[PDB]
Design a protein around this ligand. Structure first.
Ligand SMILES: CC(C)(COP(=O)(O)OP(=O)(O)OC[C@H]1O[C@@H](n2cnc3c(N)ncnc32)[C@H](O)[C@@H]1OP(=O)(O)O)[C@@H](O)C(=O)NCCC(=O)NCCSC(=O)c1ccccc1
Ligand SMILES: [Cl-]
Ligand SMILES: [Cl-]
Ligand SMILES: [Fe+3]
Ligand SMILES: [Fe+3]
Length: 472
């Protein structure tokens, strides 16, 4: 009987039924945010960006707000006159403003899946704030959290506007599942794991948000133009999430590098006696997050992924730049093949291999970031370089699900895996050591010993700016 205004650029107030249904959902979102959102944050004033438009020349306001009061809203890319579908059997036909009946349940399931990862990530990350290495980093965490939240609103809008009764019902159930719960877990495995320390947070935003970039880019070409327009704008916001992850780790590497030079050493035990995260341990964290995330792209060879492209529901990454016929009935793609005791390659029909193409696009983007990290050790004259493990290492989805592959690409026995994987994935004692460094640091402009200062602040504010005010 008091209803918050929902900001949007979709003219929500013109469609009273849709406005009332979303208002009916809002209090439940707020209840979920208060219980599963960032712990103890109810009174904090945080310096945050809030979307107020979709102009690529200034679409966000920056100012202090309490997160429970954050102005979540619905923002789609601008509609385009007579926009056409650009791939699949529907190529050249007009885009859709409502979902065709034959595609309803598939498109709904895609949209639900995407929506579910959003509150999941917040649930995984809600305790991080208590051990934040700086007010800068606490603010970045919170910004990622409020945006995760807006991405739930984004999908819930679509479910209500375009999927009828079950759409409403999906929206409620999106707040009823919980990451790691035994009875109602979240949908994807990776979104039921713990994010137990800030090193994992930075790797998750560097690597796992990037799956989000590539899935969202694929949906941004959807023939279902309301979904396309939603996803286009989500990609604009997700770029900052990828920067938090990439620069986080860069900053850890820098610090470790600094201490290697100052102590004149390489010895991990001496480096840990100084409270830095040694580069080989970092490499295991990269191995873990990379491999686990890679599974999210799905089976390398897939009939479903074929139908999603042919039917026009999900494009390829940067579909419009690709120089083929955008239908693919006579196209090929090269994938791996487990060939007895060897890993070989083989060509398969392109339509059947779309999940592998998207995985490969994602690998290339991760490698470009890893190349940028490796400038730091090079700067210092150190030999160490970060690498990506072979794509079959530590997989549970697809052709490698049942075998073991070492980071360097060898098929290995079950016993070689049990005795060697400690060199490749974080051990219990690695995880304990990383955890022992996680002390909160909250005075303006001070940074915990395990991570260097960032290059600049946020929204032209200084590095020492009071980015969270606590009202203790
Ligand atoms: C492409 C996927 C990912 C998977 O497609 P599907 O069709 O479901 O699966 P396939 O194409 O692999 O199916 C091939 C076949 O393999 C079968 N199979 C066997 N075992 C399994 C098994 N154990 N598990 C699964 N499948 C298994 C399967 O049944 C099928 O069998 P048949 O061939 O019929 O015999 C789809 O979910 C999609 O487009 N999602 C939308 C985008 C999305 O995910 N967005 C989230 C991005 S993150 C982000 O936003 C964010 C990040 C950080 C913070 C916040 C946010
Ligand atoms: Cl569904
Ligand atoms: Cl074996
Ligand atoms: Fe997101
Ligand atoms: Fe994100």
């Amino acid at each position: 009987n008091y209803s918050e205004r929902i900001p949007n650029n979709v003219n929500l107030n013109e469609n009273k039924t849709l406005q009332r249904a979303l208002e009916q959902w809002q209090p439940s979102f707020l209840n979920w945010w208060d219980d599963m959102g960032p712990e103890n944050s109810s009174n904090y004033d945080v310096y945050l960006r809030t979307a107020v438009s979709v102009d690529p020349k200034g679409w966000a306001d920056f100012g202090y707000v309490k997160m429970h009061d954050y102005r979540w809203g619905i923002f789609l890319a601008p509609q385009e006159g007579e926009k056409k579908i650009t791939f699949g059997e529907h190529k050249g036909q007009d885009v859709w403003q409502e979902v065709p009946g034959e595609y309803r349940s598939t498109l709904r399931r895609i949209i639900v899946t995407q929506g579910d990862t959003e509150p999941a990530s917040v649930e995984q990350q809600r305790h991080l704030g208590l051990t934040a290495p700086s007010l800068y980093d606490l603010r970045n965490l919170f910004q990622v959290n409020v945006e995760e939240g807006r991405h739930l609103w984004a999908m819930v809008y679509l479910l209500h506007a375009h999927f009828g009764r079950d759409g409403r019902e999906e929206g409620e159930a999106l707040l009823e599942r919980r990451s790691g719960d035994e009875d109602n877990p979240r949908i994807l495995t990776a979104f039921n794991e713990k994010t137990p320390d800030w090193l994992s947070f930075f790797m998750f935003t560097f690597i796992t948000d990037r799956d989000g970039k590539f899935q969202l880019a694929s949906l941004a070409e959807s023939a279902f133009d309301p979904l396309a327009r939603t996803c286009k704008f989500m990609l604009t916001e997700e770029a900052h999430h990828l920067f938090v992850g990439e620069s986080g780790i860069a900053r850890v590497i820098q610090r470790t590098c600094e201490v290697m030079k100052e102590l004149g050493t390489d010895d991990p035990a001496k480096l840990r006696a100084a409270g830095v995260i040694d580069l080989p341990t970092l490499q295991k964290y990269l191995n873990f997050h990379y491999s686990v995330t890679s599974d999210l792209y799905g089976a390398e060879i897939s009939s479903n992924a074929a139908t999603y492209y042919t039917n026009g529901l999900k494009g390829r990454f940067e579909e419009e730049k690709i120089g083929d016929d955008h239908k693919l009935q006579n196209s090929e793609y090269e994938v791996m093949d487990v060939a007895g005791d060897k890993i070989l390659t083989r060509h398969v029909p392109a339509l059947s291999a779309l999940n592998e193409r998207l995985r490969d696009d994602w690998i290339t983007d991760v490698q470009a970031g890893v190349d940028r990290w490796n400038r730091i050790p090079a700067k210092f004259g150190f030999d160490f370089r970060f690498t990506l493990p072979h794509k079959g290492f530590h997989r549970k989805i697809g052709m490698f699900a049942d075998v073991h592959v070492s980071p360097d690409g060898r098929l290995i026995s079950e016993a070689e895996w049990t005795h060697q994987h400690k060199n490749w994935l974080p051990t219990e004692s690695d995880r304990l050591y990383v955890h022992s460094l996680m002390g909160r640091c909250l005075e303006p402009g001070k940074f915990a010993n395990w991570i260097a200062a960032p290059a600049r602040g946020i929204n032209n504010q200084p590095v020492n700016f009071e980015y969270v005010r606590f009202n203790w």
